Design a binder for this molecule. Sequence first.
Ligand SMILES: O=C1C[C@@H](C(=O)O)NC(=O)N1
Ligand SMILES: [Zn+2]
Ligand SMILES: [Zn+2]
Ligand SMILES: [Zn+2]
Ligand SMILES: [Zn+2]
Length: 362
Amino acid sequence: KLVRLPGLIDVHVHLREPGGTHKEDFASGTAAALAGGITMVCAMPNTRPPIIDGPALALAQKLAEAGARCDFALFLGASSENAGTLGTVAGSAAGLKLYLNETTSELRLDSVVQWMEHFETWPSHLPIVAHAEQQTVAAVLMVAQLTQRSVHICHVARKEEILLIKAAKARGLPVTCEVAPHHLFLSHDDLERLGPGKGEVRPELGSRQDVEALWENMAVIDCFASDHAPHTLEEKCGSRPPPGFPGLETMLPLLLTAVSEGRLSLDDLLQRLHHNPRRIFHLPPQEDTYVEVDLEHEWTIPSHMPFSKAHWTPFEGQKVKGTVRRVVLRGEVAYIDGQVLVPPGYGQDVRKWPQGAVPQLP
Ligand SMILES: O=C1C[C@@H](C(=O)O)NC(=O)N1
Ligand SMILES: [Zn+2]
Ligand SMILES: [Zn+2]
Ligand SMILES: [Zn+2]
Ligand SMILES: [Zn+2]
């Protein structure tokens, strides 16, 4: 007997197109999404070229429309040059992404004043999300308060961070956050097995106490999001390993296992992979869209999942219970038992749907 879930939403994926298509492209990354029970993704802007200007966004939109198999929205990225220039295209994006820790030269902000300028110029009704670790959480929260608006914190990974956000919520501040599965299901205890290259990720893997704190503070976590960050094994195992894990194909099975064990409820999962993504990012419903899962099937994660071009996974060897059997997307069968059945280009930019515009005052 299968359980019918709504179309799940992953608000944090790296699909690598343009410019990194040996790691993933829209077609392979959205195949991975569908096989993970995800019907809508929000793609990050740290591509090559990065999505930091209108021409780059226009290119990425066409590449996504041609390659995506599930629906999507595309983030814009903040740069040291683009504050006050994105007003005409801002509403067509998922939101604005700020990379506030170590990043590329194109996305690097060298001063908190540049963060302020983005918060002051980006349209006030549109989402802002930040890669903000440790004290950077507190710093970006201060900028948000100075500019009188909300912020969403990506991939919270530490006891320190979740407790800070908890304290901010207790003071009524408009902050939301997401957590990635590797910060719930892996820790320092796994670094020996992974090795130093595969184990590289930002935020880094936490201690057992960090992991425990995230679970104990589940009420503070608004969303789950994979931070699907595919790189090839050659890259992960080479001399300058890039940080990141693929995660679209493993996120839902890992979380269903936890539901099975009573660590969180099915509702808790659906708030965090459906309702709260919708409401924080003002993402539209997908008509005639659902995911059927088998909660009884026990399996072991293999050395690579079928679809991501990363062709490796840090969750190899973990025992999970729960699997995606079928996905229907806008009335068409998109996935059954390991076969993706919608072509590249089936997916659409949800920000172009009438119901997908973010409401604003005239
Ligand atoms: O901040 C980031 C970016 C990401 C990537 O590979 O794009 N991978 C990571 O581990 N953290
Ligand atoms: Zn990040
Ligand atoms: Zn995020
Ligand atoms: Zn990311
Ligand atoms: Zn519901």
